[PDB]
Amino acid sequence: EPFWADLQPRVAFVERGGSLWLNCSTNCPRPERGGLETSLRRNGTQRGLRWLARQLVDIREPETQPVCFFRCARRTLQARGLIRTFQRPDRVELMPLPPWQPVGENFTLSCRVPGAGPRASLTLTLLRGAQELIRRSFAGEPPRARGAVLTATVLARREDHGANFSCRAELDLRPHGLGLFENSSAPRELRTFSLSPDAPRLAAPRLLEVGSERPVSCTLDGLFPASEARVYLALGDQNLSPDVTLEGDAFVATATATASAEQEGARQLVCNVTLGGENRETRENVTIYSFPAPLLTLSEPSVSEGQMVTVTCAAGAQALVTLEGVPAAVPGQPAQLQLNATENDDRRSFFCDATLDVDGETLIKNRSAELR
Ligand SMILES: *[C@@H]1O[C@H](CO)[C@@H](O[C@@H]2O[C@H](CO)[C@@H](O[C@@H]3O[C@H](CO)[C@@H](O)[C@H](O[C@H]4O[C@H](CO)[C@@H](O)[C@H](O)[C@@H]4O)[C@@H]3O)[C@H](O)[C@H]2NC(C)=O)[C@H](O)[C@H]1NC(C)=O
Ligand SMILES: *[C@@H]1O[C@H](CO)[C@@H](O[C@@H]2O[C@H](CO)[C@@H](O[C@@H]3O[C@H](CO)[C@@H](O)[C@H](O[C@H]4O[C@H](CO)[C@@H](O)[C@H](O)[C@@H]4O)[C@@H]3O)[C@H](O)[C@H]2NC(C)=O)[C@H](O)[C@H]1NC(C)=O
Ligand SMILES: *[C@@H]1O[C@H](CO)[C@@H](O[C@@H]2O[C@H](CO)[C@@H](O[C@@H]3O[C@H](CO[C@H]4O[C@H](CO)[C@@H](O)[C@H](O)[C@@H]4O)[C@@H](O)[C@H](O)[C@@H]3O)[C@H](O)[C@H]2NC(C)=O)[C@H](O)[C@H]1NC(C)=O
Ligand SMILES: *[C@@H]1O[C@H](CO)[C@@H](O[C@@H]2O[C@H](CO)[C@@H](O[C@@H]3O[C@H](CO)[C@@H](O)[C@H](O)[C@@H]3O)[C@H](O)[C@H]2NC(C)=O)[C@H](O)[C@H]1NC(C)=O
Ligand SMILES: *[C@@H]1O[C@H](CO)[C@@H](O[C@@H]2O[C@H](CO)[C@@H](O[C@@H]3O[C@H](CO)[C@@H](O)[C@H](O)[C@@H]3O)[C@H](O)[C@H]2NC(C)=O)[C@H](O)[C@H]1NC(C)=O
Ligand SMILES: *[C@@H]1O[C@H](CO)[C@@H](O)[C@H](O)[C@H]1NC(C)=O
Ligand SMILES: *[C@@H]1O[C@H](CO)[C@@H](O)[C@H](O)[C@H]1NC(C)=O
Ligand SMILES: *[C@@H]1O[C@H](CO)[C@@H](O)[C@H](O)[C@H]1NC(C)=O
Ligand SMILES: *[C@@H]1O[C@H](CO)[C@@H](O)[C@H](O)[C@H]1NC(C)=O
């Protein structure tokens, strides 16, 4: 006292990878030496009498304490400064949501903002839409501390399905006159779902014939989102493409199928739905049969009175036949009737009863032909 050594400015705040000027001086009349201790890269530089100046550029260092030294009178004169690099949130990220999140299942939300500083100036917010869920001021984290993460565990709500969630970070440079700088991570929309036991209730008649169209329905309730769930219904390889009704959490699929001409109904009826990563499938055994329509013929179909006529009917040998009350004799093949034409037999029609049993189910076909 005297002398002294001064560095200007003593405190400095700059952009990361940014630059500034430093003027370090002393009152020493004939400095025997002078210079600056720092690790930072220098672009330009200046100097003069009793004062030396440096432009330091590309500063990625969160905290650096450079020191200007002047050697005078075989003695060292040191002045230490402080350099801090602030960070704008050019990078704000948020973790992938569950592709489907079961409603009622706790899931977690993490917001990672790599390279954020100073940590003590940061207030982070995890929020659903306009409403803040969790807010964290990091003030009091060490001056050298950089980076910020916020995790919040959350219960899944049904009314919160389809909303937009985000992580908003707020940096306060207001004390330094630089002011607030805030940013928002890419908003993520959540997909949720719900299910239930009691596999789908499918209703169908168990008997089927080709060339005939019969309706079949499959339903279930307590399913959300109803609209976002897709359902499949088919007979064997053949798809029914049913009419799908959706009311609230319940659905209705109605169609009218047609038998496929092949074997079965040892085939099956498959009703399944896929929502989220889950599926509930119920199956139904059934029966498709082939029952050839019985043919009724007469020769001559129109005859004079008294002329002998013949009449026959056949089920294809696999079914039993009743011809005008007369059973097939013998059963394995068609029966017959013959007579002399009668005046009272004009406009007389005859019945042919074909009976085929499958799974105990008795099937009949009434077919008649009038005589002229
Ligand atoms: C869904 O997520 C939530 C959020 O993490 C969470 O629910 C919690 O489940 C746990 C275990 O089921 C419970 O947590 C605690 O349970 C004890 C009883 O053993 C309570 O006494 C606790 O109350 C105090 O908790 C703090 C102490 O750690 C106190 O500081 C505070 O003042 C409370 O008085 C606490 O509830 C509980 O069932 C809930 N907790 C809450 C508050 O919701 C869990 O991860 C998921 N819930 C499920 C799966 O049911
Ligand atoms: C309803 O839910 C059911 C869940 O089981 C689901 O079943 C699937 O049906 C399809 C046909 O519709 C299956 O078909 C596959 O077809 C291809 C040929 O194109 C095969 O390569 C597949 O191979 C499997 O089976 C082979 C033997 O045939 C094996 O060698 C092989 O290793 C495989 O196991 C298979 O035959 C399909 O496998 C099933 N299952 C699944 C998990 O998809 C049905 O699709 C659902 N309906 C809808 C629209 O959601
Ligand atoms: C250190 O890195 C520097 C970059 O950070 C490089 O800068 C060299 O020098 C100048 C200044 O940076 C560059 O720009 C030139 O600017 C003048 C105009 O000068 C303006 O400012 C003066 C006050 O100084 C003012 O009086 C004038 O009215 C202007 O408004 C232009 O006319 C030039 O064409 C030029 O663009 C140079 O480009 C750059 N040098 C080279 C070779 O590119 C430099 O590499 C390092 N050194 C210094 C001293 O900065
Ligand atoms: C950093 O070094 C000092 C800051 O302390 C600055 O020195 C300045 O130099 C000018 C030169 O014209 C001074 O102007 C005159 O100096 C004479 C003495 O040489 C004096 O008699 C005059 O009255 C007048 O002041 C100026 O005073 C001086 N500034 C200060 C604050 O002392 C220099 O400009 C700075 N350089 C850089 C690159 O920052
Ligand atoms: C949260 O933000 C999203 C947008 O980021 C809002 O939902 C969006 O609604 C629009 C308009 O219906 C959807 O647009 C399109 O729908 C057609 C179907 O007609 C589809 O083909 C397009 O590909 C597109 O999806 C859009 O899907 C939907 N956005 C998302 C992310 O699903 C929503 O309204 C906002 N929620 C709140 C609470 O404000
Ligand atoms: C906000 O985030 C976007 C996307 O990462 C980024 O490009 C942008 O620089 C940020 N804006 C501000 C001013 O923080
Ligand atoms: C459906 O098919 C299976 C063959 O795996 C059979 O065991 C079962 O008895 C059938 N169901 C009915 C109701 O007949
Ligand atoms: C019907 O035809 C048969 C066959 O020739 C004949 O024997 C019989 O007399 C005929 N019956 C009558 C009542 O015409
Ligand atoms: C004859 O036709 C009627 C009307 O379609 C039907 O209800 C009945 O089952 C048939 N008779 C027999 C024995 O198949």
Short mmCIF file of C-alpha atoms and ligand atoms in Angstrom, two decimals, residues 232 272 274 279 281, ligand 2:
data_model
loop_
_atom_site.label_atom_id
_atom_site.label_comp_id
_atom_site.label_asym_id
_atom_site.label_seq_id
_atom_site.Cartn_x
_atom_site.Cartn_y
_atom_site.Cartn_z
CA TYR A 232 -62.10 -58.50 -35.92
CA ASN A 272 -61.15 -60.54 -30.84
CA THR A 274 -56.83 -55.20 -29.91
CA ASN A 279 -56.27 -58.56 -26.71
CA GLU A 281 -60.37 -63.43 -27.91
C1 LIG B 2 -57.08 -61.65 -32.82
O1 LIG B 2 -56.18 -62.16 -31.86
C2 LIG B 2 -55.40 -63.25 -32.31
C3 LIG B 2 -54.41 -63.62 -31.21
O2 LIG B 2 -53.96 -64.94 -31.40
C4 LIG B 2 -54.67 -63.02 -33.65
O3 LIG B 2 -54.26 -64.30 -34.11
C5 LIG B 2 -53.40 -64.27 -35.27
O4 LIG B 2 -54.05 -64.76 -36.41
C6 LIG B 2 -53.24 -64.72 -37.56
C7 LIG B 2 -54.08 -65.01 -38.80
O5 LIG B 2 -55.16 -64.10 -38.85
C8 LIG B 2 -52.06 -65.68 -37.42
O6 LIG B 2 -51.55 -65.83 -38.76
C9 LIG B 2 -50.15 -65.93 -39.13
O7 LIG B 2 -50.07 -66.01 -40.55
C10 LIG B 2 -48.74 -65.98 -41.14
C11 LIG B 2 -48.88 -66.29 -42.62
O8 LIG B 2 -49.36 -65.14 -43.30
C12 LIG B 2 -47.81 -67.00 -40.46
O9 LIG B 2 -46.46 -66.74 -40.84
C13 LIG B 2 -47.92 -66.94 -38.93
O10 LIG B 2 -47.02 -67.90 -38.37
C14 LIG B 2 -47.40 -68.34 -37.05
O11 LIG B 2 -47.93 -69.64 -37.13
C15 LIG B 2 -47.10 -70.47 -37.91
C16 LIG B 2 -47.81 -71.78 -38.21
O12 LIG B 2 -48.89 -71.52 -39.07
C17 LIG B 2 -45.77 -70.68 -37.18
O13 LIG B 2 -44.90 -71.40 -38.02
C18 LIG B 2 -45.13 -69.35 -36.81
O14 LIG B 2 -44.07 -69.57 -35.91
C19 LIG B 2 -46.16 -68.42 -36.17
O15 LIG B 2 -46.53 -68.91 -34.90
C20 LIG B 2 -49.38 -67.10 -38.51
O16 LIG B 2 -49.83 -68.34 -39.05
C21 LIG B 2 -51.21 -65.13 -36.27
O17 LIG B 2 -50.12 -65.96 -35.92
C22 LIG B 2 -52.10 -65.06 -35.03
N1 LIG B 2 -51.38 -64.61 -33.84
C23 LIG B 2 -50.80 -63.42 -33.71
C24 LIG B 2 -50.01 -63.23 -32.44
O18 LIG B 2 -50.88 -62.50 -34.53
C25 LIG B 2 -55.53 -62.27 -34.67
O19 LIG B 2 -54.78 -61.70 -35.72
C26 LIG B 2 -56.25 -61.12 -33.98
N2 LIG B 2 -57.04 -60.34 -34.91
C27 LIG B 2 -56.82 -59.03 -35.05
C28 LIG B 2 -57.13 -58.43 -36.39
O20 LIG B 2 -56.38 -58.33 -34.14
#
